[PDB]
Structure formats: structure tokens, C-alpha cells
Write a protein that binds this ligand. Structure first.
Ligand SMILES: Nc1ccccc1NC(=O)CCC/C=C/CC(=O)Nc1ccccc1
Lengths: 71, 71
DNA sequence: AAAGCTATTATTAGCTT
DNA sequence: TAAGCTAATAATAGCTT
């Protein structure tokens, strides 16, 4: 980025929503790439600060989860 | 990297294990940064191709999950 | 070997219209 | 404004020892 930042909670709800949308995309993109490159099951559940749910899974969520609990 | 790659399953078990260890770290690092920067609950469950489990959660893994199912 | 290096591609923080 | 740009930081693929 234009400037290095420090990893601490962004206080401005506006920049926080924006950063959240950029980085959520970035996080799902890498999760997907890791699933394909290395052949693994992955599940990513994300609730933003307003409690809205976002999710990614390399297959049906319900399966990754049960494999976790059965583990 | 030294060369751009294409997103497809790595056929060599050796390079696949190596890429998996590098990128898993990279994926958890971004998940963590997103949790802190934007104040959200996150859960990431990963099973490699040999079925070993790896996981990250911004709180107890089982709390994020219950919040998902209760959702 | 396998732990680390670096040239290179990828992501992104702040800015711009 | 908010959609997109780009200067700059970050991650990593292949190499190095
Ligand atoms: N079908 C499906 C298709 C596409 C995307 C997602 C889904 N899947 C769901 O929409 C619901 C997931 C159900 C979860 C099954 C296992 C489980 O319930 N695991 C658990 C729950 C609470 C606490 C701990 C562990």
C-alpha cells in the first residue's frame, strides 16, 4: 500500500468497511488457491463487526464441519 | 514469485507439501490481520491432502461454529 | 536435503476523479 | 461519493547452498 500500516482495529467505520471488503476478497482468493494448488478441504466462516455472515468452503460447508466434529 | 504460476493441483507431492506449508501460513496470517483490522470473528478449518487437520479461529473454534449453526 | 534467499508477482492503503 | 488507480508493501516460486 501507499504506506505500511500497523495491525490494529480500524476506528473509522467507513475505512473499516472498505478495508473489510477488499481483504475479505483477498482472503477468499488465497483460500481457494490453496484448496486447488494443494488439494485440500477448506472452510472459512467470517462474521463482520455488524454480525453479518460471510463464508467460503471448497465443498458443502456441512461436510467440512462434520469432518471436523467427527475428527 | 520467480515465475507466475497457474492455479491447478500440484502433481509433485514434494513441491505440494512445501507450497502447502508456505501458503497455509500466509492464509492464517491474513485471516488474523482481517480479524484485528476489522473486528470480526473468523474460523478457518483446513485438512491437507493427507487428511491432517489445521485450524485457526479468532476465538474458541467451537464458539464460531455454534454461532454459524444457530445463525 | 531442507532451510533460507531474492527476483518476481500479488495485494493493498491512500489517493484521485 | 464510491469506483478505480498506483505507489508501495507483502507474499511467494524457484533457486541457492
Ligand atoms: N449444504 C450446504 C451447501 C452449500 C454451502 C453450505 C451448506 N451447508 C449449510 O448451509 C449448513 C451447514 C451445516 C453444518 C453441519 C455440521 C455441524 O453442524 N457442525 C457443528 C455445528 C455447531 C457446532 C459445532 C459443529
Amino acid at each position: 500500500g501507499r504506506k505500511k500500516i500497523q495491525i490494529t482495529r480500524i476506528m473509522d467505520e467507513r475505512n473499516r468497511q472498505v478495508t473489510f471488503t477488499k481483504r475479505k476478497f483477498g482472503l477468499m482468493k488465497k483460500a481457494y488457491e490453496l484448496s486447488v494448488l494443494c488439494d485440500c478441504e477448506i472452510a472459512l466462516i467470517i462474521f463482520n463487526s455488524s454480525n453479518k455472515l460471510f463464508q467460503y468452503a471448497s465443498t458443502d460447508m456441512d461436510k467440512v464441519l462434520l469432518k471436523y466434529t467427527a475428527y
